Amino acid sequence: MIKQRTLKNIIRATGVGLHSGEKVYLTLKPAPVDTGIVFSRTDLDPVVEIPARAENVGETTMSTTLVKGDVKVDTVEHLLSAMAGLGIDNAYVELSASEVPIMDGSAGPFVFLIQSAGLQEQEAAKKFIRIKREVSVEEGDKRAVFVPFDGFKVSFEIDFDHPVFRTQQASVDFSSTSFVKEVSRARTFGFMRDIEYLRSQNLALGGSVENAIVVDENRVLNEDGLRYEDEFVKHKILDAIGDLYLLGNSLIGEFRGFKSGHALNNQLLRTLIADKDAWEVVTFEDARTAPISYMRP
Ligand SMILES: C[C@@](CCN1Cc2cc(C#CC#CC3(CO)CC3)cn2C1=O)(C(=O)NO)S(C)(=O)=O
């Protein structure tokens, strides 16, 4: 069978919040079968645990934020992307502060640290959410849709006019083991234009060339430029895999986003969950006939 996966060992990282600029200590821990990904604010007494699920999402403003009462876990999309990409069902994510560390802006450091520690297949069937009908949402021109597909595939189009794009489209099939190579190292990005305002609403406070692609009027500012020519839209795919993992299981279907962000991504999951004829939960008692395959543990 395609088995549930956790971490083989505990992982410790130290970084900064992209939006808060706060020093945070990250501890990823093994978790039992059917735990899912649970975030934990360990700086609070008592410890406050928020499962990484669609229902727990609060604001979706320049990131995906989980909320329980007045308590928040901000910027979960890149770490969840990494977990989703490597096929991690069950893990406790402890944070010493409200926001996940930004690292280099990518999921690369997360996939590196996780695979350094390694994965543990568990004695239980991995559950997948199979898309059964098309499910679309639209906020005027912006647009997000799930369509049935035999495997996992994510398509996305940046529509907006800026000199730096030399149109950014991409469409990637993650039915096999493509995630690390294709999208993992795609960094987040922001415009010099927006920084003054974002800092005024307590955002991008930890933002710099170290953890992001910074885009002036005409040029990328980063000394060493891009990792891929389509890095911008590859990151929109990275974000999408993160947000989509808030379903709490791996997807068997296709996602297409036209200028869709965290807001629409979450609207999509909320509608999908509501429409129980548009999806079902499946396991695979034989991995050889499954539409998805994963890296050796
Ligand atoms: C939400 C989104 C973008 C997130 N970011 C990344 C990001 C970097 C940035 C900056 C700066 C800077 C500066 C200087 C000041 O020190 C050095 C000049 C601001 N910003 C921002 O809002 C994302 O990746 N979410 O996961 S996205 C791709 O749009 O969906």
Ligand SMILES: [Zn+2]
């Ligand atoms: Zn992002």
